[PDB]
Amino acid sequence: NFCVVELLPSDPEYNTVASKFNQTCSHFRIEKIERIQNPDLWNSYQAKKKTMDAKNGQTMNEKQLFHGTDAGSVPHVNRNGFNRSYAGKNAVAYGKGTYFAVNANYSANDTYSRPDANGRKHVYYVRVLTGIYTHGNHSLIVPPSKNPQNPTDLYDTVTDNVHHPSLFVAFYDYQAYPEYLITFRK
Ligand SMILES: Cc1nc2sc3c(c2c(=O)[nH]1)CCC3
């Protein structure tokens, strides 16, 4: 179960999200920003965060990243996050997983945030447990092993460019929490 709370332009939380979005997407008109409150999904995300925070030392395991999707996926994502049956997984080049962008402009592409019948576009500002990452490749269904001599000990995510990332691919449930939905237009 979940709730959706629309944020008022005056709210500092609205400002924070909007500021991030407008670094690359100020040419768009923001209609609204909503917080998604799904307790079970959040708890499960935090449970993953705790285990990663113990394991990776000084690593800042969490990033806030963007994900565009069609209107029709919003119900699915609000309930289940970016889980196995999430339809928006046609990008394959860095792995078969869910893609998140460092900057909003990637996610604002019409192929990802498909405008609906009323012209509105949908981008989530998502907490993602990027952890320790490496370069992705087309064949991945889970991250690569850190050392091939232990095939079961894997990276947390993959990226297009390890030292200047523009995207991250996550492969597991509870690795991303869909905290805010930004509804906007041209
Ligand atoms: C459905 C969806 N697919 C993809 S692939 C990709 C991004 C993206 C997104 O935001 N939504 C952002 C950068 C590379």
Side-chain angles (χ1 to χ4, degrees), residues 88-118:
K89 300 179 205 213
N90 298 59
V92 177
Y94 298 103
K96 312 181 212 285
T98 305
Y99 289 56
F100 304 92
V102 173
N103 296 317
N105 51 24
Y106 279 18
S107 295
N109 195 286
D110 291 340
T111 294
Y112 304 144
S113 51
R114 176 173 299 107
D116 63 29
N118 304 263

Short mmCIF file of all heavy atoms in Angstrom, two decimals, residues 88-118:
data_model
loop_
_atom_site.label_atom_id
_atom_site.label_comp_id
_atom_site.label_asym_id
_atom_site.label_seq_id
_atom_site.Cartn_x
_atom_site.Cartn_y
_atom_site.Cartn_z
N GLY A 88 9.50 -1.30 -18.69
CA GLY A 88 10.51 -0.40 -19.26
C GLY A 88 11.96 -0.87 -19.14
O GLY A 88 12.78 -0.21 -18.47
N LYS A 89 12.27 -1.99 -19.80
CA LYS A 89 13.61 -2.59 -19.83
C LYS A 89 13.89 -3.06 -21.25
O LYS A 89 14.05 -4.27 -21.51
CB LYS A 89 13.75 -3.78 -18.87
CG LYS A 89 13.49 -3.46 -17.41
CD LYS A 89 13.64 -4.72 -16.57
CE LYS A 89 12.83 -4.64 -15.28
NZ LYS A 89 13.51 -5.38 -14.19
N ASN A 90 13.90 -2.11 -22.18
CA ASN A 90 14.28 -2.37 -23.57
C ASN A 90 15.73 -1.98 -23.86
O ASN A 90 16.30 -2.46 -24.85
CB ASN A 90 13.32 -1.68 -24.53
CG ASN A 90 11.91 -2.20 -24.39
OD1 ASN A 90 11.32 -2.13 -23.30
ND2 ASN A 90 11.36 -2.77 -25.46
N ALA A 91 16.32 -1.10 -23.03
CA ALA A 91 17.75 -0.78 -23.11
C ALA A 91 18.57 -1.97 -22.62
O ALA A 91 18.30 -2.53 -21.55
CB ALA A 91 18.08 0.46 -22.29
N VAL A 92 19.53 -2.38 -23.44
CA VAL A 92 20.29 -3.59 -23.17
C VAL A 92 21.81 -3.38 -23.16
O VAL A 92 22.52 -4.23 -22.62
CB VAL A 92 19.88 -4.71 -24.18
CG1 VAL A 92 20.71 -5.98 -24.00
CG2 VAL A 92 18.40 -5.06 -24.03
N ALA A 93 22.32 -2.27 -23.72
CA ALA A 93 23.74 -2.15 -24.08
C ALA A 93 24.71 -2.23 -22.89
O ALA A 93 25.81 -2.75 -23.05
CB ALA A 93 24.00 -0.90 -24.88
N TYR A 94 24.30 -1.74 -21.72
CA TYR A 94 25.07 -1.87 -20.47
C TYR A 94 24.52 -2.95 -19.51
O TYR A 94 24.99 -3.08 -18.38
CB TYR A 94 25.19 -0.50 -19.78
CG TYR A 94 25.94 0.51 -20.62
CD1 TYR A 94 25.25 1.51 -21.32
CD2 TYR A 94 27.33 0.46 -20.76
CE1 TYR A 94 25.93 2.43 -22.13
CE2 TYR A 94 28.01 1.38 -21.57
CZ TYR A 94 27.31 2.36 -22.23
OH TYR A 94 27.95 3.29 -23.03
N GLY A 95 23.56 -3.75 -19.98
CA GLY A 95 22.96 -4.82 -19.18
C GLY A 95 21.45 -4.78 -19.21
O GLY A 95 20.86 -3.73 -19.46
N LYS A 96 20.84 -5.94 -18.96
CA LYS A 96 19.38 -6.07 -18.86
C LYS A 96 19.01 -5.76 -17.41
O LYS A 96 19.03 -6.64 -16.55
CB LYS A 96 18.91 -7.48 -19.24
CG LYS A 96 19.47 -8.05 -20.54
CD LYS A 96 18.92 -9.45 -20.82
CE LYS A 96 19.91 -10.35 -21.54
NZ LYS A 96 20.01 -9.99 -22.99
N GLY A 97 18.70 -4.50 -17.13
CA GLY A 97 18.32 -4.04 -15.79
C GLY A 97 17.53 -2.75 -15.91
O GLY A 97 17.11 -2.40 -17.01
N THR A 98 17.36 -2.05 -14.80
CA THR A 98 16.74 -0.72 -14.81
C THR A 98 17.76 0.42 -14.83
O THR A 98 18.68 0.48 -13.99
CB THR A 98 15.76 -0.54 -13.64
OG1 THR A 98 14.79 -1.60 -13.66
CG2 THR A 98 14.99 0.78 -13.79
N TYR A 99 17.58 1.36 -15.77
CA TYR A 99 18.52 2.45 -16.01
C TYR A 99 18.08 3.71 -15.27
O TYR A 99 16.87 4.04 -15.23
CB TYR A 99 18.69 2.70 -17.53
CG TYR A 99 19.47 1.62 -18.29
CD1 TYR A 99 19.08 0.28 -18.27
CD2 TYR A 99 20.59 1.94 -19.06
CE1 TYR A 99 19.78 -0.69 -18.98
CE2 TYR A 99 21.30 0.96 -19.77
CZ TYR A 99 20.89 -0.36 -19.71
OH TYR A 99 21.60 -1.34 -20.41
N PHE A 100 19.04 4.38 -14.63
CA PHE A 100 18.84 5.64 -13.97
C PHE A 100 19.89 6.63 -14.46
O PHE A 100 21.04 6.26 -14.66
CB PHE A 100 18.95 5.45 -12.47
CG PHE A 100 18.00 4.43 -11.95
CD1 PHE A 100 18.39 3.09 -11.82
CD2 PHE A 100 16.70 4.78 -11.64
CE1 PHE A 100 17.48 2.15 -11.36
CE2 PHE A 100 15.79 3.85 -11.18
CZ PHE A 100 16.18 2.53 -11.05
N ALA A 101 19.48 7.88 -14.64
CA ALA A 101 20.34 8.96 -15.16
C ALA A 101 20.82 9.89 -14.06
O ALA A 101 20.08 10.22 -13.14
CB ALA A 101 19.58 9.78 -16.20
N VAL A 102 22.07 10.31 -14.18
CA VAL A 102 22.63 11.33 -13.30
C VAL A 102 21.90 12.66 -13.43
O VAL A 102 21.66 13.37 -12.42
CB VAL A 102 24.15 11.52 -13.57
CG1 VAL A 102 24.70 12.70 -12.79
CG2 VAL A 102 24.91 10.26 -13.17
N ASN A 103 21.58 13.03 -14.67
CA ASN A 103 20.91 14.31 -14.95
C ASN A 103 19.53 14.08 -15.54
O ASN A 103 19.30 13.09 -16.24
CB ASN A 103 21.75 15.12 -15.91
CG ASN A 103 23.10 15.51 -15.32
OD1 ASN A 103 23.18 15.90 -14.16
ND2 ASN A 103 24.15 15.37 -16.09
N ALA A 104 18.62 15.01 -15.27
CA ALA A 104 17.24 14.85 -15.69
C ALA A 104 17.07 14.78 -17.20
O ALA A 104 16.22 14.06 -17.67
CB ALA A 104 16.37 15.96 -15.12
N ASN A 105 17.92 15.49 -17.96
CA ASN A 105 17.78 15.57 -19.43
C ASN A 105 17.75 14.22 -20.14
O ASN A 105 17.03 14.05 -21.11
CB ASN A 105 18.86 16.47 -20.06
CG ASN A 105 20.29 16.12 -19.61
OD1 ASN A 105 20.61 14.99 -19.20
ND2 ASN A 105 21.15 17.11 -19.68
N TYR A 106 18.56 13.27 -19.69
CA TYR A 106 18.48 11.90 -20.23
C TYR A 106 17.07 11.32 -20.07
O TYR A 106 16.46 10.85 -21.03
CB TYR A 106 19.50 11.00 -19.54
CG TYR A 106 20.92 11.07 -20.06
CD1 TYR A 106 21.38 12.15 -20.83
CD2 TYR A 106 21.82 10.04 -19.77
CE1 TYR A 106 22.69 12.18 -21.29
CE2 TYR A 106 23.13 10.08 -20.24
CZ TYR A 106 23.55 11.16 -20.98
OH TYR A 106 24.83 11.20 -21.43
N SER A 107 16.55 11.42 -18.85
CA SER A 107 15.25 10.88 -18.50
C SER A 107 14.06 11.62 -19.12
O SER A 107 12.98 11.03 -19.32
CB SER A 107 15.11 10.86 -16.98
OG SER A 107 16.07 9.95 -16.44
N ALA A 108 14.27 12.89 -19.43
CA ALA A 108 13.27 13.72 -20.11
C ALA A 108 13.09 13.41 -21.60
O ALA A 108 12.19 13.97 -22.22
CB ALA A 108 13.59 15.21 -19.92
N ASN A 109 13.92 12.55 -22.16
CA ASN A 109 13.75 12.06 -23.53
C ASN A 109 12.37 11.48 -23.68
O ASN A 109 11.89 10.76 -22.78
CB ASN A 109 14.80 10.97 -23.84
CG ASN A 109 14.94 10.67 -25.33
OD1 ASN A 109 14.09 10.03 -25.93
ND2 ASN A 109 16.08 11.06 -25.90
N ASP A 110 11.71 11.80 -24.80
CA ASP A 110 10.35 11.31 -25.06
C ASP A 110 10.26 9.79 -25.17
O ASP A 110 9.19 9.25 -24.96
CB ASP A 110 9.74 11.93 -26.33
CG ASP A 110 9.44 13.41 -26.18
OD1 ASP A 110 9.33 13.93 -25.05
OD2 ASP A 110 9.33 14.06 -27.23
N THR A 111 11.34 9.12 -25.56
CA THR A 111 11.35 7.65 -25.58
C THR A 111 11.17 7.04 -24.16
O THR A 111 10.63 5.96 -24.01
CB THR A 111 12.64 7.10 -26.22
OG1 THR A 111 12.67 7.45 -27.61
CG2 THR A 111 12.72 5.57 -26.11
N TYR A 112 11.64 7.74 -23.14
CA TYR A 112 11.55 7.25 -21.77
C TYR A 112 10.32 7.84 -21.09
O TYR A 112 9.39 7.11 -20.77
CB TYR A 112 12.84 7.61 -21.01
CG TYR A 112 14.12 7.11 -21.66
CD1 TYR A 112 15.30 7.88 -21.61
CD2 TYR A 112 14.19 5.87 -22.30
CE1 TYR A 112 16.47 7.43 -22.20
CE2 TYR A 112 15.35 5.42 -22.89
CZ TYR A 112 16.49 6.21 -22.84
OH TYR A 112 17.67 5.80 -23.40
N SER A 113 10.29 9.16 -20.89
CA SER A 113 9.12 9.82 -20.36
C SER A 113 8.12 10.14 -21.50
O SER A 113 7.94 11.31 -21.87
CB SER A 113 9.52 11.04 -19.56
OG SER A 113 10.40 11.89 -20.26
N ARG A 114 7.51 9.10 -22.06
CA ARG A 114 6.60 9.22 -23.22
C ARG A 114 5.47 10.19 -22.88
O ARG A 114 4.81 10.00 -21.87
CB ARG A 114 6.03 7.85 -23.59
CG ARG A 114 5.00 7.86 -24.73
CD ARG A 114 4.59 6.46 -25.16
NE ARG A 114 5.73 5.69 -25.67
CZ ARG A 114 6.35 4.67 -25.04
NH1 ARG A 114 5.96 4.21 -23.85
NH2 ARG A 114 7.40 4.10 -25.64
N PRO A 115 5.27 11.24 -23.70
CA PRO A 115 4.12 12.10 -23.39
C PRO A 115 2.81 11.33 -23.55
O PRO A 115 2.65 10.57 -24.50
CB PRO A 115 4.24 13.25 -24.41
CG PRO A 115 5.65 13.21 -24.89
CD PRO A 115 6.02 11.76 -24.86
N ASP A 116 1.93 11.48 -22.58
CA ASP A 116 0.61 10.82 -22.63
C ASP A 116 -0.32 11.60 -23.59
O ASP A 116 0.09 12.61 -24.19
CB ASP A 116 0.01 10.68 -21.21
CG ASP A 116 -0.26 12.00 -20.52
OD1 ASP A 116 -0.53 13.01 -21.22
OD2 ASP A 116 -0.22 12.04 -19.26
N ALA A 117 -1.58 11.16 -23.69
CA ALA A 117 -2.60 11.83 -24.51
C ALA A 117 -2.82 13.33 -24.19
O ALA A 117 -3.23 14.09 -25.06
CB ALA A 117 -3.92 11.07 -24.41
N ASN A 118 -2.51 13.74 -22.96
CA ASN A 118 -2.60 15.15 -22.54
C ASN A 118 -1.27 15.91 -22.52
O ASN A 118 -1.18 16.98 -21.92
CB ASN A 118 -3.25 15.20 -21.16
CG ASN A 118 -4.60 14.51 -21.14
OD1 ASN A 118 -5.64 15.16 -21.26
ND2 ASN A 118 -4.60 13.19 -21.03
#
